[PDB]
Design a protein around this ligand. Structure first.
Ligand code: HEM
Length: 152
């Protein structure tokens, strides 16, 4: 649950992402894959990537980064009223991709890391607080659907 002022911070930060969605999406996935190499094994189309240089050179990884952040941005713009947008993603990630909630924690922290890396000194403590709360809400509502499905 976020206040109006917190949502305003989230959507202000998101403007930074929308200026370069592919570059942000690429770096988020690279941070996930290099920090948590077990996550790469869930992607049949990226498991061939052995080095970060190959990851950086992969145009399909940048494409998928655009898909991921476009979906997340659509959810964030609903300011919590995201049941219709979130349900299909919860279902596909639990039942088809088999993504444990832990990996959603990993990618949430990766987003925070990338924002500081690309905007050092321009991602203030209030903005980090609000973005963190928004990603916690996203993860918590996914977790509720995971529990319904019995997925661990
Ligand atoms: C912010 C969190 C995430 C968002 C918004 C997101 C979004 C998406 C979307 C929109 C798709 C394509 C449609 C679909 O299959 O539902 C997708 C596919 C997929 N996601 Fe995610 N995802 C997220 C996190 C993760 C994480 C953490 C993992 C694994 C560590 C993951 C694994 C996958 C896989 C394996 C696919 C299929 C890729 C393919 O072969 O095309 N997702 N995701």
């Amino acid at each position: 649950g976020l206040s109006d002022g917190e949502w305003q911070q989230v959507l202000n930060v998101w403007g930074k992402v929308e200026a370069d969605i592919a570059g942000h999406g690429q770096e988020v996935l690279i941070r996930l894959f290099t920090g948590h190499p077990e996550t790469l094994e869930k992607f049949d189309k990226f498991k061939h990537l052995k080095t970060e240089a190959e990851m950086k050179a992969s145009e399909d990884l940048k494409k998928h980064g655009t898909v991921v952040l476009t979906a997340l941005g659509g959810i964030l713009k609903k300011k919590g009223h995201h049941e219709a947008e979130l349900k299909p993603l919860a279902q596909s990630h639990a039942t088809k991709h088999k993504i444990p909630i832990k990996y959603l924690e990993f990618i949430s922290d990766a987003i925070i890391h990338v924002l500081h890396s690309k905007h050092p000194g321009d991602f203030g403590a209030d903005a980090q607080g609000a973005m963190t709360k928004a990603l916690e809400l996203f993860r918590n509502d996914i977790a509720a659907k995971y529990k319904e499905l019995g997925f661990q």
